[PDB]
Write a protein that binds this ligand. Structure first.
Ligand SMILES: Nc1nc2c(ncn2[C@@H]2O[C@H](COP(=O)(O)OP(=O)(O)OP(=O)(O)O)[C@@H](O)[C@H]2O)c(=O)[nH]1
Ligand SMILES: Nc1nc2c(ncn2[C@@H]2O[C@H](COP(=O)(O)OP(=O)(O)O)[C@@H](O)[C@H]2O)c(=O)[nH]1
Ligand SMILES: Nc1nc2c(ncn2[C@@H]2O[C@H](COP(=O)(O)OP(=O)(O)O)[C@@H](O)[C@H]2O)c(=O)[nH]1
Ligand SMILES: [Mg+2]
Lengths: 53, 132, 432, 430, 430
């Protein structure tokens, strides 16, 4: 009965301020690694020369 | 700063308490999680046994409680090395750099995927010689 | 086959080493009992027992037993070597003379015996990492004695110290300006690299980034542990551009007397607002050079830069690092010293940062840690000298030092040594 | 006969070498296990040049891998083509040079070379008729520039008449990874001009531009840069392993490219290089290859070839083509650009033709040119050196290992002497 | 099959023997009822060395239990493993010795020793190829030193060829339990140098500091001290009961450790001994065992081995290992500590290897040393004897049993003679 003061849901003891966001749980839960992206790797590295075709 | 003698039971931090806690013959060697490690009372109405370290009872022959040492405790070099030349394998320990077991040895399927990928692919051998 | 030995002395050193070892165990997958469930990257910090558990390469020193006993009775009682936790009986009581002349002389022999036993097992010993807070008596006294002994005992082995100097105004003790100067004297002539880790800077970093308004010492130690892990990851993880311990201060120390440096880490952010920004390699390197995100309470805008050893871990590409460095160079608000055309030593690693469960940080895929050597570091020494001069003008608190075996004239000599250091920093940074 | 050996040192040299052997094995049809899987007889015709023959019929490269730490040499063995090299040819220390030229040449490197000189001596003794040596190393590192230049001096003493090749990667200011690059790069140049017969310089700056623009791929890595150098390296010795209309080994290149003994620093380039999306819009002909060959943006050096005058240039053509086309194109470029070619030497371009093009290409060209424009690189490196040395910054490391400041001043004078002597012929007239 | 018989006397000897038969039965997997319950067949091929077979397949040890009062042998029967010993092997008188050497050696010992000599002869003639005798007793007591040394002389008069081992617990001046120890300690030593081929002395003072300093157990009892001696005693005959790479029986020790006939006094030690708290944090290897076995504080005697020089030492390794490490460490420890080894004899250490480690361990080492520092133990006892004898204190009991002062004077003379004869090799130069 004490949590709802706007002083227990903000500035707790040794914890980040509680900002009640909701994330998409179909992703984001198992091994999601933040960041922008996986620096999208390009097709062909050494076969631009010696095309093999 | 000299060594004291026994005055207190092995629950206080008076010197030479660590070994007494390690001895499993004493009742005090085995404590409760809720004694210490307790944030607040209402979290658990329970008690749980946790034990202090993992140590054998006898100071000598301490290597007991390991199933591996018991198995090879009666194996002789002649028994180890002279089994039978149909089913015996080398047991010597080599230099680590010589047993590296490189990538293409780890996954041989990559090898036949390769070769046709790069080797013997798209060769054009043309020679301007009179006879050839 | 490359090892490093860590020495923890003082309560601050112990309480930061606890977090550092928690983080290392989490990274390498070693349970608190020391076993591994299911290549040999651990060899730089741990040692195989022959069958099963792995023992950390650390030794703990203190004179007051409460902090050590908590380690021996906590959840990590099955990891550390029982005879490597060295403790005394009586505290130093924030007195430098007690830890260096009266009661610190009876335990350094045991410490050197333990260090010799540890080093005899190692084969590729790279160097030492010493953790100690400087504002305390036993941290300054035993640290000084141990550094002096280890220097003459080991010769050319590189020693790195992660020291927590007193903060400008927010500080705990009252006589700490006295004993900090003596330990500064002692370390200046015996350490190879010193790091500034004052307390206000970490508080402001937490409040601004993690949105934490009541941080405790557990939060502060995690950042230091992350810094140490990022620094040392090049010794135990393969990367596109690897850098060793000996390839740190041969590129950071222009002159032997100038080896004090301060660090920064980025990105330091929580999960709630790391999703509204992309954390690109171009933007993380700007926050690293941003003065407000600096782990030492100093203003880099008041001095020139000498050399920046800045380390990347994650999935960065050597392509993108060069462009960011070029932008930093072409920016006008940051100026380097004239006689140093190239000033960046860049390292890249493949292992991404790790997050400890129950922590505050995020599990990002990029991170940059920078060790910067600059001329602006003289301000902390000048303010410490002023604070000392205010008190010493009428011999306040001196009878506690004189009565414990220390001579009266040591304070003066330390004062001229700090003045000489100020003069050196002033003369080095002038334009040619 | 006339076979050559390979020595690589440092991290940069090892990565270059680890990809060069990948390229060569593909041309001769050698799998990573050392078993021949080719289709034509010409592949096995001249395999004695680069490979040894062991019992059981397996081919092993005659290469020596040296370094002072096992970090990079453990990765090369654990990756592909790690089983190609002989395990006993791996020689390395335990400490590491620590990016210190003095440590890699005076204290630690000098101690190790007793072992590595033995395997090199054994390799060069068992060969039928040695042709020369070739070295791959970087001038911006400790063990690469330190031990690498010392190894050249001692091998030269034992083999005065043989020829030496060096594929050197010098450090450019735009891409800097070390703060003491100007020091050890300058010291390496001093010993390099005295002993090495041929020196080819490579820039990480220029390789990025080629990969950025010509190949038009957004994210290059060190893997791709090593491949660009590898193609040119195999191109120089192409006519040594295959028949052709005009034959020219390494010695023939040296005679026709070096007018004076101290001027032996070259720039190299490769053609054709086209992107994936634009490869079907091009037609492979001699007139269009020579355009990309002489393109100033195609050179692997930061020096602009149009800022000086070409003392001489050489082109190595591979594939099926007519000599009339080749000869008439090299004449036209010289006449159209007589300003950029020095005028007291007539027809200063040498052309060679080989009958076997590279893997999967109808035609390819390797360009090696000696131009006065290479002075700019040394000038900008020396400018960085004199600013640092005027304050004696970072000099306590070198002075603390037996070498004194006398050598630093002496090395700078020789390097500055080279530029002044090299620029003299740019303005010299008949 | 080269089997030995066991004789124990007095309270200390019986207690050591009671604990010793517990370890041996544990090693061979023998039920306290005498029934075999082992796992491998290696435990039965050599069981005749220590145990005799009876009807029903039970095994009975061949041991003789001798004393002058039934108090101690009532406890040994009621204690653990008390059912093994045959009731016919208990011999005792109804009076006791009372800490008097003469009573146990002249009056009561003489009239009783005929019976114990019969059972010893009965057991000895039962075996086919006798190997020798081993005796456990204490020299600080009445029935132990007195009646024990009388039986030692009697057997040597009958079996002059067999080897005789003794595990004697000599008094230590630091910890005292009796006021008349110096008298009967010197008297029995006089009768040992002419009869015993090997003597291994033990101090209770040395045991107490080992438990307090190494094992770090707060309240040790005599059960713990009895265990330490038992482990070392059982390790001596390890190579005689199990297969190995370098076998060595008791006679191979006597020949290889005794340079001169009157230098057969040894000190013993065991490894690895570790505290209960730090058992899992140390690795068991040959380098670690060989370092600890030579520690001055690991010996079983109050004498300090670094105050003299070793003549000859023997190490009996146990468990499966490699010989090269064993051979290299003995050479290494001998060269680094050449000050502690006498020079006129080369390579004065023997190595023996057995392939069966003790139960509950994986490797173990027993050390037997012949060092000049063992005389420091005799000096302390001799010094106390002179102070008491000059005032003729407590002498009326010895003179009251037909014993004269003349052999009191002879005892001190021979005791001093041994020390003088034994220290003149300490600084002898060839
Ligand atoms: N960052 C950080 N600093 C700490 C911590 N604990 C103590 N300190 C610092 O240490 C200073 C006081 O010295 P302490 O480390 O507490 O004690 P000490 O160095 O062992 O010296 P003694 O008091 O004589 O035992 C304080 O001003 C703090 O700034 C900690 O857990 N984290
Ligand atoms: N082409 C290429 N250059 C590299 C590679 N690795 C490092 N370099 C360059 O080499 C320079 C450093 O040389 P370094 O490897 O430290 O020399 P070493 O210390 O003797 O091994 C850097 O400026 C890099 O740009 C690589 O794999 N390929
Ligand atoms: N190690 C050991 N020593 C013992 C034991 N019992 C007695 N002693 C020692 O033996 C000494 C006395 O010897 P004692 O029994 O009187 O000899 P005895 O009269 O001939 O039987 C004492 O100093 C004790 O220290 C025992 O069980 N173990
Ligand atoms: Mg404290």
């Amino acid at each position: 009965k004490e949590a709802k003061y706007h002083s227990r849901q903000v500035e707790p003891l040794g914890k980040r301020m509680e900002r009640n966001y909701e994330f998409p749980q179909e992703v984001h839960q198992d091994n999601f690694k933040f960041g922008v992206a996986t620096i999208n790797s390009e097709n062909t590295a050494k076969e631009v020369m010696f095309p093999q075709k | 700063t000299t060594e004291p003698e026994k005055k207190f039971n092995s629950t206080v931090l008076i010197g030479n308490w660590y070994e007494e806690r390690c001895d499993p013959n004493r009742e005090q060697s085995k404590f409760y999680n809720e004694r210490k490690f307790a944030d607040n009372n209402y979290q658990k109405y329970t008690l749980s046994e946790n034990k202090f370290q993992d140590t054998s009872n006898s100071w000598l022959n301490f290597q007991e409680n390991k199933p591996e040492v018991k198995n090879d405790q009666f194996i002789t070099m002649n028994m180890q090395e002279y089994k039978k030349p149909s089913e015996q394998k080398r047991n010597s320990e080599l230099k680590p750099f010589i047993v590296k077991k490189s990538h293409f040895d780890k996954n041989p399927h990559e090898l036949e995927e390769y070769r046709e990928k790069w080797t013997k692919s798209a060769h054009t051998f043309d020679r301007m010689y009179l006879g050839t | 086959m490359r090892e490093v030995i860590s020495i923890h002395v003082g309560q601050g050193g112990i309480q930061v080493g606890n977090a550092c070892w928690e983080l290392f165990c989490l990274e390498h997958g070693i349970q608190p009992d020391g076993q591994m469930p299911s290549d040999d990257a651990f060899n730089t910090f741990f040692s195989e027992t022959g069958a099963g558990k792995h023992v950390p390469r650390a030794v703990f020193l203190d004179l007051e037993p409460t902090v050590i006993d908590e380690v021996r009775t906590g959840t990590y009682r099955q990891l550390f070597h029982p005879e490597q936790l060295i403790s005394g009986k009586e505290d130093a009581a924030n007195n430098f003379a007690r830890g260096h002349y009266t009661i610190g002389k009876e335990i350094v022999d045991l410490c050197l015996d333990r260090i010799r036993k540890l080093a005899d097992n190692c084969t590729g010993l790279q160097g030492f990492l010493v953790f100690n807070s400087v504002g305390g008596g036993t941290g300054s006294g035993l640290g000084s004695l141990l550094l002096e002994r280890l220097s003459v005992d080991y010769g050319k082995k590189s020693k790195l110290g992660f020291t927590i100097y007193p903060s400008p105004q927010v500080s705990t003790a009252v006589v700490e300006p006295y004993n900090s100067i003596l330990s500064t004297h002692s370390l200046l002539e015996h350490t190879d690299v010193a790091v500034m880790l004052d307390n206000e800077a970490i508080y402001d970093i937490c409040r601004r980034n993690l949105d934490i308004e009541r941080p405790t010492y557990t939060n502060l130690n995690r950042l230091i542990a992350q810094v140490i892990s990022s620094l040392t990851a090049s010794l135990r993880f393969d990367g596109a551009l690897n850098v060793d311990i000996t390839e740190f201060q041969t590129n950071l120390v222009p002159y032997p007397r100038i080896h004090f440096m301060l660090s920064s880490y980025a990105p330091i952010i929580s999960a709630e607002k790391a999703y509204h920004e992309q954390l690109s390699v171009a933007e993380i390197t700007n926050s690293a050079f941003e003065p407000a995100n600096m782990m030492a309470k100093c203003d880099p805008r008041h001095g020139k830069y000498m050399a920046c050893s800045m380390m990347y871990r994650g999935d960065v590409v050597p392509k993108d690092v060069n462009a960011s460095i070029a932008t930093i160079k072409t920016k006008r608000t940051i100026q380097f010293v004239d006689w140093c055309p190239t000033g960046f030593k860049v390292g890249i690693n493949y292992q991404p940062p790790t997050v400890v469960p129950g922590g505050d940080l995020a599990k990002v895929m990029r991170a940059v840690c920078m060790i910067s050597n600059s001329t602006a570091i003289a301000e902390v020494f000048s303010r410490l000298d002023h604070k000392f001069d205010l008190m010493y003008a009428k011999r306040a608190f001196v009878h506690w030092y004189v009565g414990e075996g220390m001579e009266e004239g040591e304070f003066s000599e330390a004062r001229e040594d700090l003045a000489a250091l100020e003069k050196d920093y002033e003369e080095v940074g002038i334009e040619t | 006969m006339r076979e050559i050996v390979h020595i690589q040192g440092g991290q940069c040299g090892n990565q270059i070498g680890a990809k060069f052997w990948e390229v060569i094995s593909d041309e001769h049809g050698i799998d990573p296990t050392g078993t021949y899987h080719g289709d034509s007889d010409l592949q096995l015709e001249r395999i004695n040049v680069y490979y040894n023959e062991a019992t059981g019929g397996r081919y092993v490269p005659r290469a020596i891998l040296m370094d002072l730490e096992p970090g990079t040499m453990d990765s090369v063995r654990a990756g592909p083509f790690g089983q190609l090299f002989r395990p006993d040819n791996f020689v390395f220390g335990q400490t590491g040079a620590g990016n210190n030229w003095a440590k890699g040449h005076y204290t630690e490197g000098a101690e190790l070379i007793d072992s590595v000189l033995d395997v090199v001596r054994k390799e060069a003794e068992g060969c039928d008729c040695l042709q020369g040596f070739q070295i791959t190393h970087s001038l911006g590192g400790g063990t690469g520039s330190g031990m690498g230049t010392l190894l050249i001096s001692k091998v030269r003493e034992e083999y005065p008449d043989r020829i030496m090749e060096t594929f050197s990667v010098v450090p450019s200011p735009k891409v800097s990874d070390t703060v003491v690059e100007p020091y050890n790069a300058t010291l390496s140049v001093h010993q390099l001009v005295e002993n090495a017969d041929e020196c080819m310089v490579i820039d990480n700056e220029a390789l990025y531009d080629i990969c950025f623009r010509t190949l038009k791929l957004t994210t290059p890595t060190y893997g791709d840069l090593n491949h660009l150098v590898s193609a040119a390296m195999s191109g120089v010795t192409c006519c040594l392993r295959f028949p052709g209309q005009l034959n020219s080994d390494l010695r023939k290149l040296a005679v026709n490219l070096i007018p004076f003994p101290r001027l032996h620093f070259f720039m190299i380039g490769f053609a054709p290089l086209t992107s994936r999306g634009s490869q079907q819009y091009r037609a492979l002909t001699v007139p269009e290859l020579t355009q990309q060959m002489f393109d100033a943006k195609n050179m692997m050096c930061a020096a602009d070839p149009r800022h000086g005058r070409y003392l001489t240039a050489s082109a190595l053509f591979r594939g099926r083509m007519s000599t009339k086309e080749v000869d008439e194109q090299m004449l036209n470029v010289q006449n159209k650009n007589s300003s950029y070619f020095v005028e007291w030497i007539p027809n200063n371009i040498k052309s060679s033709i080989c009958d076997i093009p590279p893997k999967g290409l109808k035609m390819a060209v390797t360009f090696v040119g000696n131009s006065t424009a290479i002075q700019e690189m040394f000038k900008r490196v020396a400018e960085q050196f004199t600013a640092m040395f005027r304050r004696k910054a970072f000099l306590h490391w070198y002075t603390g290992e037996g070498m004194d400041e006398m050598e630093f001043t002496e090395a700078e004078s020789n390097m500055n002497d080279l530029v002044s002597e090299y620029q003299q012929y740019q303005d010299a007239t008949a």
